[PDB]
Design a protein around this ligand. Structure first.
Ligand SMILES: [Cl-]
Ligand SMILES: [Cl-]
Ligand SMILES: [Cl-]
Ligand SMILES: [Cl-]
Ligand SMILES: [Cl-]
Ligand SMILES: [Cl-]
Ligand SMILES: [Cl-]
Ligand SMILES: [Cl-]
Ligand SMILES: [Cl-]
Ligand SMILES: [Cl-]
Ligand SMILES: [Cl-]
Ligand SMILES: [Cl-]
Ligand SMILES: [N+]
Ligand SMILES: [N+]
Ligand code: NA
Ligand code: NA
Ligand code: NA
Ligand code: NA
Ligand code: NA
Length: 129
């Protein structure tokens, strides 16, 4: 599924991501924009052989099982495919774990490089939330 911007904002809020660990909703929408362009089915292979899955490009090195990332963990206790669903529940639950791991949203390199410090409220501006 390719979400609309306000549609994704609403779904993220529904699932308790808004202000989670102090990160406003626009931070999360911005991260999703640059990780996946709001496409739940996005996948990307990393140099290390891990793969990133879903709207927040959650990595199989630590967070999910895909059966083909040697030496990896599955700390969200989910198949990586669950992260591609039109329903964002599994991505949101796993993101909450990731952002609580110590480095906040810096876990998402694209957030650090493209969202951090910017006017992230623009990503939710206009939305009925
Ligand atoms: Cl929109
Ligand atoms: Cl957009
Ligand atoms: Cl915001
Ligand atoms: Cl894996
Ligand atoms: Cl694996
Ligand atoms: Cl393969
Ligand atoms: Cl493996
Ligand atoms: Cl594990
Ligand atoms: Cl699995
Ligand atoms: Cl959803
Ligand atoms: Cl933080
Ligand atoms: Cl940018
Ligand atoms: N919010
Ligand atoms: N990785
Ligand atoms: Na689509
Ligand atoms: Na992989
Ligand atoms: Na894994
Ligand atoms: Na894969
Ligand atoms: Na999901």
């Amino acid at each position: 599924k390719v979400f609309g911007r306000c549609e994704l904002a609403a779904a993220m809020k529904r699932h308790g991501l808004d202000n989670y660990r102090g990160y406003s909703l626009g931070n999360w929408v911005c991260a999703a924009k640059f990780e996946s362009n709001f496409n739940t089915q996005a996948t990307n292979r990393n140099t290390d052989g891990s793969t990133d899955y879903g709207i927040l490009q959650i990595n199989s090195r630590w967070w999910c099982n895909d059966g083909r990332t040697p030496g990896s963990r599955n700390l969200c206790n989910i198949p990586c495919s669950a992260l591609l669903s039109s329903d964002i529940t599994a991505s949101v639950n796993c993101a909450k774990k990731i952002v609580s791991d110590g480095n906040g949203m810096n876990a998402w390199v694209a957030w650090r490089n493209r969202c951090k410090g910017t006017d992230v409220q623009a990503w939710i501006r206009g939305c009925r939330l």
